Amino acid sequence: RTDCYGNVNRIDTTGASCKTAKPEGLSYCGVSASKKIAERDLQAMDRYKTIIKKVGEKLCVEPAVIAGIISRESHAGKVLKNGWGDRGNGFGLMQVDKRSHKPQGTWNGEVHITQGTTILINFIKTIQKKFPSWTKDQQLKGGISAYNAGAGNVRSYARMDIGTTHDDYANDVVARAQYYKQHGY
């Protein structure tokens, strides 16, 4: 159903770096900061809950992981302009980069979340192949990190997020995702 690629609850996380938290207005960092940021985005997220869950169920990925990416990438659409990110390259709740993939659908619909989620799954698969001695959940983590920085950037489990935006991509996302999971996603 939703567990084909792992369980976010089983992944270890150090959460948001201060590079991510500060700018969001927090005076502290880590897992609790991630969750606080996730909570500030819940109401906006809730607007798309049904769709997030429908796509997760379709593709056999946890809806909370999709929600976590959404929060991180666009704050559930709050920082977008007609679906575009501030540099004009990312499109949609999940911020598909127009330079790498032609964007499909409306910015906040099922087509878009499908596309973004598919890209994610492809990164997961690549990591599964690249490190077949990792556990499924570890692989999920690596797939999320790659979503931000590419598969090439994942050379180990411990330092995967170095080189991602704020050096905390997946750790942050996973912490946000754990908050979501707690909230019915």
Range of the domain at 151: 1-185
Catalytic residue among 41, 73, 161, 172: 73
Distances (CA, A) of 180 to 27, 99, 151, 156: 22, 30, 26, 27
Catalytic residue among 12, 24, 39, 86: 86
Decide if 73 is catalytic: yes
Q: Distance between CA atoms of 109 and 89, rounded to whole angstroms?
A: 18
Number of domains in the chain: 1
DSSP bridge pairs for 30:
16
Q: Distance between CA atoms of 35 and 103, rounded to whole angstroms?
A: 29
Q: The CATH number of the domain where 46 resides is what?
A: 1.10.530.10
Provide DSSP, the chain: ---TT--GGGS----B-HHHHGGGT-S--BHHHHHHHHHHTHHHHHTTHHHHHHHHHHHTS-HHHHHHHHHHHHTTTTT-BTTB-TTS-EETTTTEETTTS---S-TTSHHHHHHHHHHHHHHHHHHHHH-TTS-HHHHHHHHHHHHHH-GGG---STTTTBTBGGG-HHHHHHHHHHHHHHTT-
CB of 56 closer than 8 Å to CB of 121 = no
Determine the residue type at 8: V
Q: Distance between CA atoms of 10 and 12, rounded to whole angstroms?
A: 6
Q: Distance between CA atoms of 88 and 98, rounded to whole angstroms?
A: 9
CA neighbor of 183 nearest in space, from 62, 14, 100: 62
